[PDB]
Amino acid sequence: STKKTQLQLEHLLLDLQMILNGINNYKNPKLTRMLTFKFYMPKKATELKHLQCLEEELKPLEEVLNLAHSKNFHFDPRDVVSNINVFVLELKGFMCEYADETATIVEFLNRWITFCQSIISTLT
């Protein structure tokens, strides 16, 4: 059950990282357009229940990705985000509380990639 939860986090993390790579190889001036789209971060992210703040931000995430023409990505935005949605559902087993600051898409991915890495460490 803790070995199971840890593996789901391992997969969730794969997805986040996969997206973040697509985005750091957006060698298109259009990147400015993308980074202007603002994402909401969680006030605190210390427990699985806090993945709520990731669930609620997935629609805006999928949208922003769709703007970047497909040629640029190895994955399909709607797919990689459905995927992430599924994991988050199985991992939170509450109401979300947001930080006052917004962040670019890249900072947002980082915050969560980190969060995943933390939990995974403490579960080892």
Strand and helix layout:
Blueprint: H1 2-24, H2 31-36, E1 39-42, H3 52-55, H4 58-67, H5 77-92, E2 98-103, H6 105-122
Antiparallel strand pairs: 1-2
Helix pairs in contact: 1-5, 1-6, 4-5
What does this protein structure show overall?
This is Interleukin-2. Belongs to the IL-2 family. Keywords: Adaptive immunity, Chromosomal rearrangement, Cytokine, Disulfide bond, Glycoprotein, Growth factor, Immunity, Pharmaceutical, Proto-oncogene, Secreted, Signal. It is found in: Secreted. The chain has a single domain (1-124), classed as Growth Hormone, Chain: A (Up-down Bundle). Helices cover 62% and strands 8% of the residues. Helix 1 (2-24) runs antiparallel to helix 5, helix 1 (2-24) packs antiparallel against helix 6 and helix 4 (58-67) runs antiparallel to helix 5 (77-92). The chain has 6 helices and 2 strands. It has 124 residues and is mainly alpha-helical. It has a two-stranded antiparallel ribbon. It starts with a helix and ends with a helix.
- CATH C-level class: Mainly Alpha
Sheet of most strands: 2 strands, antiparallel
* Count of spatially separate domains: 1
Number of helices: 6
SSE string: HHEHHHEH
Strand order of the largest sheet: 1-2
What CATH architecture would you give? Answer: Up-down Bundle
What is the fold named in CATH at topology level? Growth Hormone, Chain: A
How far apart, in Å, are the first and last alpha carbons?
Answer: 13 Å
The percent range for strand residues is: 5-15%
Fraction of residues in helix:
55-70%
Instruction: Tell me the Rg in angstroms.
Output: 14 Å
Shape: globular
Total number of strands:
2
Helix vs. strand class: mainly alpha
Main location: secreted
Subcellular location: Secreted
Organism: Homo sapiens
GO cellular component, one term: extracellular region
